[PDB]
Short mmCIF file of C-alpha atoms and ligand atoms in Angstrom, two decimals:
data_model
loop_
_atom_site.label_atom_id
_atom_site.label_comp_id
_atom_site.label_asym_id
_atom_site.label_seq_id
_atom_site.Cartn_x
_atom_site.Cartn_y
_atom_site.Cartn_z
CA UNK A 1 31.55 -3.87 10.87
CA UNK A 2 33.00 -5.67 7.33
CA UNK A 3 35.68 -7.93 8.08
CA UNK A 4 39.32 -7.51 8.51
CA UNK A 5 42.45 -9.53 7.40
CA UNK A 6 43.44 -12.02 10.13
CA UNK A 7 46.64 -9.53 10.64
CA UNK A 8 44.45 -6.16 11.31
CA UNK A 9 42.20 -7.73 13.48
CA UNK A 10 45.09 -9.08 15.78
CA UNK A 11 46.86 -5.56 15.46
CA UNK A 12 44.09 -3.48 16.13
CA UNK A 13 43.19 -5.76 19.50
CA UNK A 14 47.18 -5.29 20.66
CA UNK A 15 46.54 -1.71 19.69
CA UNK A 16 43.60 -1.14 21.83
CA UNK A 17 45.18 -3.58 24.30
CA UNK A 18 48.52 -1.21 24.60
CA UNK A 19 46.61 2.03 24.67
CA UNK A 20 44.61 0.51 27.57
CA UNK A 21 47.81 -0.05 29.33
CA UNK A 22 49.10 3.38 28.40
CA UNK A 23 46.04 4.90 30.41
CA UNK A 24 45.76 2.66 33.41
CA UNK A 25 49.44 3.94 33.84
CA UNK A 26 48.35 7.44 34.59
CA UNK A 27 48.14 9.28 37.53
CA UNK A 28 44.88 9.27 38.52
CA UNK A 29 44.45 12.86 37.95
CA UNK A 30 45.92 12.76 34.82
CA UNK A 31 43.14 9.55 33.45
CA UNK A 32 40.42 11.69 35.06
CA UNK A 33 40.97 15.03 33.01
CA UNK A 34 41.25 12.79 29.98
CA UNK A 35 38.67 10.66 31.15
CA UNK A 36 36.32 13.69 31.52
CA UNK A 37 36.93 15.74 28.45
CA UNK A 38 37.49 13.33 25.94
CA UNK A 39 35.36 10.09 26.77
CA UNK A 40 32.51 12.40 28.37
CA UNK A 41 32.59 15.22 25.76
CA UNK A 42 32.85 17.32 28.90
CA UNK A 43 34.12 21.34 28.75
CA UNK A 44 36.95 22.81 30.93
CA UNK A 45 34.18 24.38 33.13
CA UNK A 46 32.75 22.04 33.55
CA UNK A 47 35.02 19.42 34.70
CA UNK A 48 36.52 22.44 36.97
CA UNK A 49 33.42 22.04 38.97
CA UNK A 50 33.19 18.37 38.82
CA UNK A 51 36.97 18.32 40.57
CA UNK A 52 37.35 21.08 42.54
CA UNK A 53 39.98 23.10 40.66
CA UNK A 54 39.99 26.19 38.30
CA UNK A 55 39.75 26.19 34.80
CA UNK A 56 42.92 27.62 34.02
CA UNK A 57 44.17 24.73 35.89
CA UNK A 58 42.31 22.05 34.13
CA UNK A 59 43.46 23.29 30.90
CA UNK A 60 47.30 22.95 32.09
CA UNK A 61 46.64 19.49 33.88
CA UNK A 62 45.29 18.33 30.44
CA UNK A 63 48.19 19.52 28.63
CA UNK A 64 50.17 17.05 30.97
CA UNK A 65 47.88 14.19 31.16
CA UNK A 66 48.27 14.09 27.25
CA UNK A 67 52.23 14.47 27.24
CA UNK A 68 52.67 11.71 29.85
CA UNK A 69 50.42 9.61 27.75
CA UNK A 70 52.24 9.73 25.01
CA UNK A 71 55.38 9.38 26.33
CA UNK A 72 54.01 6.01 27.55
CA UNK A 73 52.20 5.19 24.35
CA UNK A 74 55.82 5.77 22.70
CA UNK A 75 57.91 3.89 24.64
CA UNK A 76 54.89 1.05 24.43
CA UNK A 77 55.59 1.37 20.63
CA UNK A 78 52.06 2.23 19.57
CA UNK A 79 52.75 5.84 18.31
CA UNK A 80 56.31 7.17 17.21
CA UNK B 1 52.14 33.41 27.60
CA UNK B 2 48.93 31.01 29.10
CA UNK B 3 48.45 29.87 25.68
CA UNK B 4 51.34 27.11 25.32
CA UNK B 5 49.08 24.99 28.00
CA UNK B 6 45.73 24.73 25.96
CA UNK B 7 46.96 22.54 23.05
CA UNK B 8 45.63 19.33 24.57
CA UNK B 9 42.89 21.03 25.45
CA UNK B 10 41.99 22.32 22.28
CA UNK B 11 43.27 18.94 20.17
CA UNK B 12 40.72 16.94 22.58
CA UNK B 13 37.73 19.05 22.07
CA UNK B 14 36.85 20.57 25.29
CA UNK B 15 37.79 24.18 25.13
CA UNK B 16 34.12 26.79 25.30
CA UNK B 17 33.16 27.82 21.16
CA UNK B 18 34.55 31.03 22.78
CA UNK B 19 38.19 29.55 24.15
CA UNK B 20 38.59 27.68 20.99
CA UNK B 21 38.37 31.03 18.40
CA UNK B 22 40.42 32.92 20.73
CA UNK B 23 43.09 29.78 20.38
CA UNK B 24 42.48 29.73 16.94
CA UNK B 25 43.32 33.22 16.33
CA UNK B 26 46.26 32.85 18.47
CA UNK B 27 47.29 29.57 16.55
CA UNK B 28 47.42 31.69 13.44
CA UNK B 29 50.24 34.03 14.61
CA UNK B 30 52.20 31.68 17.11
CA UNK B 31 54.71 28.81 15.83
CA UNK B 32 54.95 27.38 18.92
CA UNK B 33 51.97 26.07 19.89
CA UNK B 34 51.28 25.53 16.49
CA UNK B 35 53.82 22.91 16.58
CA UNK B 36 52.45 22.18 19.71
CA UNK B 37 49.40 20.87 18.56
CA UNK B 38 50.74 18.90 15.91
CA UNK B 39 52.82 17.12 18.12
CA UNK B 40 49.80 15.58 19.62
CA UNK B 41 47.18 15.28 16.69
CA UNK B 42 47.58 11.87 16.58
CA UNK B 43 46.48 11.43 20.52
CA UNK B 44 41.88 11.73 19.97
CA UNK B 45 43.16 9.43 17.17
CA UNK B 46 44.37 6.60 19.17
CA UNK B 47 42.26 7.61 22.23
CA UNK B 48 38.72 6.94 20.03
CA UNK B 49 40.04 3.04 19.99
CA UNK B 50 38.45 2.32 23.00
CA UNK B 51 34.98 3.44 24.53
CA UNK B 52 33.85 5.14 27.63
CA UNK B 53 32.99 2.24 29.28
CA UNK B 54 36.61 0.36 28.90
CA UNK B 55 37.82 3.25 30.56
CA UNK B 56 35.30 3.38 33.30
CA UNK B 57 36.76 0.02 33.96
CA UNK B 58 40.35 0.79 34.31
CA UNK B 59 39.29 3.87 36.77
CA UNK B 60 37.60 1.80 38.78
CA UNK B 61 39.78 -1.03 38.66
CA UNK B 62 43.06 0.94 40.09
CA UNK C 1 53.20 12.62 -6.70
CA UNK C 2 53.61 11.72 -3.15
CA UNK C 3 51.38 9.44 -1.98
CA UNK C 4 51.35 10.02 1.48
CA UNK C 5 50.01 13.44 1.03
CA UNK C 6 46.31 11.80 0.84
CA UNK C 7 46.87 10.02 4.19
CA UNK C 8 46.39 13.17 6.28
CA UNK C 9 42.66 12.64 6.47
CA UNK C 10 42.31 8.82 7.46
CA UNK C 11 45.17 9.77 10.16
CA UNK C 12 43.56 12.61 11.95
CA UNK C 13 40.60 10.61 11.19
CA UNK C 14 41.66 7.54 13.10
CA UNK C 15 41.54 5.07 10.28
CA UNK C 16 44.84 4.50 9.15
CA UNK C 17 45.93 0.83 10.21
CA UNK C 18 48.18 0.21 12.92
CA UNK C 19 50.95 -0.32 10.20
CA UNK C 20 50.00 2.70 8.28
CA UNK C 21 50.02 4.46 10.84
CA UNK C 22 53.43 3.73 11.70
CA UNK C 23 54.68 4.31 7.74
CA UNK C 24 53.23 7.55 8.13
CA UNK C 25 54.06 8.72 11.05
CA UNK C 26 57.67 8.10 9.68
CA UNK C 27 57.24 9.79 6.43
CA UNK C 28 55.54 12.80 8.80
CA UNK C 29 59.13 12.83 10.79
CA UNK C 30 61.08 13.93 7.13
CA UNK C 31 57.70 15.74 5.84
CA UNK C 32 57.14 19.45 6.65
CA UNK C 33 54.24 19.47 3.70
CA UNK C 34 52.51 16.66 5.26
CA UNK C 35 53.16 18.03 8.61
CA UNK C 36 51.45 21.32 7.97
CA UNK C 37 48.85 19.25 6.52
CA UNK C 38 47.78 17.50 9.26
CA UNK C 39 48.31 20.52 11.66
CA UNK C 40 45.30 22.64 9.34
CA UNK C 41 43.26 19.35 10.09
CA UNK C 42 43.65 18.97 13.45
CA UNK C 43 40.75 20.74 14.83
CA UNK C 44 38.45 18.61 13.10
CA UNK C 45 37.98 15.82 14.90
CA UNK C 46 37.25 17.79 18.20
CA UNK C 47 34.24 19.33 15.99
CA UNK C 48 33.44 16.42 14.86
CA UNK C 49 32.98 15.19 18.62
CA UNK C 50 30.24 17.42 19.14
CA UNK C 51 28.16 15.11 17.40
CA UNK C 52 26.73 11.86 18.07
CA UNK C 53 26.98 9.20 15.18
CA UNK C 54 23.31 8.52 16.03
CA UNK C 55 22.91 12.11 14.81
CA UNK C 56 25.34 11.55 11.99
CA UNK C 57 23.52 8.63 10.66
CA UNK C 58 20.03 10.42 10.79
CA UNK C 59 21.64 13.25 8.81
CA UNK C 60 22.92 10.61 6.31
CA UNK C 61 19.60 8.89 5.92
CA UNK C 62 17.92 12.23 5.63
CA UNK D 1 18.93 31.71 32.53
CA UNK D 2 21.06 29.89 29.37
CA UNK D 3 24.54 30.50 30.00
CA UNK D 4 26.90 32.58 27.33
CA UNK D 5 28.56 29.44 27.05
CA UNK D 6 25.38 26.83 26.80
CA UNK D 7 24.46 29.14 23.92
CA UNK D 8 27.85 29.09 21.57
CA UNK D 9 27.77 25.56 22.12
CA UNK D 10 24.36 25.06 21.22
CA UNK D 11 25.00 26.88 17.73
CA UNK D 12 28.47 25.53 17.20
CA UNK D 13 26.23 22.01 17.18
CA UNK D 14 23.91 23.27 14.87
CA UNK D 15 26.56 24.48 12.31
CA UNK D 16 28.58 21.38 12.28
CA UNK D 17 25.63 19.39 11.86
CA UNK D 18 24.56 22.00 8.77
CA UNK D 19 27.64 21.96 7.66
CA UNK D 20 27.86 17.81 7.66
CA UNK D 21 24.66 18.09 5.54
CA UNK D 22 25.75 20.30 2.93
CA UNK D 23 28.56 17.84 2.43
CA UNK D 24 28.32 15.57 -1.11
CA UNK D 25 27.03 11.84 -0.02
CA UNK D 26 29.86 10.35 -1.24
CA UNK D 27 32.13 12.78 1.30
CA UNK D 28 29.60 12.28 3.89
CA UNK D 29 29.83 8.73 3.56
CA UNK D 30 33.41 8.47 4.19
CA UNK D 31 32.97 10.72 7.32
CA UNK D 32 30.57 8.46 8.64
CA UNK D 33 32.56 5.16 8.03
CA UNK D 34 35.95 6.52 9.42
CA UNK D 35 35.00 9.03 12.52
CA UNK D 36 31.76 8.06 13.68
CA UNK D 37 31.72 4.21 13.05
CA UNK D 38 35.39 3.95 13.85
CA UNK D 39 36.20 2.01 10.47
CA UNK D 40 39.61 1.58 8.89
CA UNK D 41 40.47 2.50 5.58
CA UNK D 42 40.03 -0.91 4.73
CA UNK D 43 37.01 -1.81 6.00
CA UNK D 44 35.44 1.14 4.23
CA UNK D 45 36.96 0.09 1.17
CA UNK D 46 35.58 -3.78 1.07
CA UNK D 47 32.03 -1.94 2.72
CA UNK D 48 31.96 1.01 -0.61
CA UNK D 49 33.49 -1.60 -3.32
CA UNK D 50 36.42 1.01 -4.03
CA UNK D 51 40.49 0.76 -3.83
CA UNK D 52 41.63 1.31 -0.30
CA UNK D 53 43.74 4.18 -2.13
CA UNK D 54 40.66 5.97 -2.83
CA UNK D 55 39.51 5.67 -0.02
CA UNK D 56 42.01 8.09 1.85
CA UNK D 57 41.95 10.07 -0.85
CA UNK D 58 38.29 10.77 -0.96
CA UNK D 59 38.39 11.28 2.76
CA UNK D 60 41.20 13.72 2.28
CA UNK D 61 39.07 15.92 0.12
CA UNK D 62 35.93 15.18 2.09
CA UNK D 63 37.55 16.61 5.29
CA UNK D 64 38.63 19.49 3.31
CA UNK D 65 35.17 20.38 1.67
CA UNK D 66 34.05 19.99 5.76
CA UNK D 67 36.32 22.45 6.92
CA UNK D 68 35.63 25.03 4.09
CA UNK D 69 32.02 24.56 4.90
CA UNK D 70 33.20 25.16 8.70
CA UNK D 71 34.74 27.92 8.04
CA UNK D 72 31.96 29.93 6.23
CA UNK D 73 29.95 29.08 8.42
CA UNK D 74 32.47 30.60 11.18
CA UNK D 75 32.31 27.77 13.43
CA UNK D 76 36.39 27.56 12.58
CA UNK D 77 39.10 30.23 11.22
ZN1 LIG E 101 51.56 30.42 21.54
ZN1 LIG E 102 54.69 14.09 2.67
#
């Protein structure tokens, strides 16, 4: 990777370091549908067999999972 | 109306080719979750700072 | 004649700065062009992820 | 014995990838830097020898060209 300034390297570590935080504090139904679909690549389906719940619901339990993390990653101050 | 619920869905990438034109088409003629999605378009952005395996980590680790 | 109006990219993208990515999340709170801008792009990156940058960089190789 | 599904995802990966090569290298380039290697505006900047500036702009229209590409190719509406 090229190299950064001395500042974006530090804020781009307390970035990732926040957004870390922000996801340990989910539920942990809420960090396994993200978990799932966006660090896997994984499809409602599928992840609806994987846990044990229908699709329909996976779609809605992502739509939380998302809103609670950004509620957290705003009040951490990462996104407004 | 089912659709307000598959905005993160859709913004993360894991709605079927055939959920995400049927969204799309929806999207076209419905404000709301229109302004739904923008509302989170800047979540894959901040979630594709870390990898798969940091997050492995904090699963296991609760 | 606005510069922020280029910046919809690099932010769906992910590549915006930390502390350009505050500046324009702030203009996008006053900005209903910008925000209609980054709502068209915000499918993109979930395409995108359908790909593997190994992929990608045989593709860009040739 | 594919699934309905297995299959329109199958194509939709063909497409994007088609329509990533159609793309002009300098557009493609850009893609690369920012989505795939997770590089910030700057860092593609000092890595391209360009202003930072063009940078987002260049990325602005290379997204765009993408997504018209995308879009006659119906992988997007
Ligand atoms: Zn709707
Ligand atoms: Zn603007």
């Amino acid at each position: 990777d090229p190299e950064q300034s001395t500042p974006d390297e530090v804020n781009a570590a307390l970035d990732r370091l926040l957004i870390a935080d922000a996801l340990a504090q989910l539920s942990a139904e809420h960090r396994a549908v993200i978990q799932r679909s966006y660090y896997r690549g994984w499809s409602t389906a599928q992840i609806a067999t994987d846990l044990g719940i229908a699709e329909g619901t996976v779609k809605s339990r992502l739509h939380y999972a998302v809103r609670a993390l950004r509620l957290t990653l705003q009040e951490l101050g990462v996104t407004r | 109306h089912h659709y307000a619920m598959w905005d993160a869905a859709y913004v993360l990438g894991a709605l079927s080719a055939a959920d995400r034109r049927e969204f799309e088409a929806h999207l076209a003629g419905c404000p709301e979750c229109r302004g739904a999605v923008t509302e989170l378009c800047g979540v894959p952005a901040l979630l594709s700072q870390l990898d798969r395996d940091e997050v492995a980590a904090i699963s296991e680790s609760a």
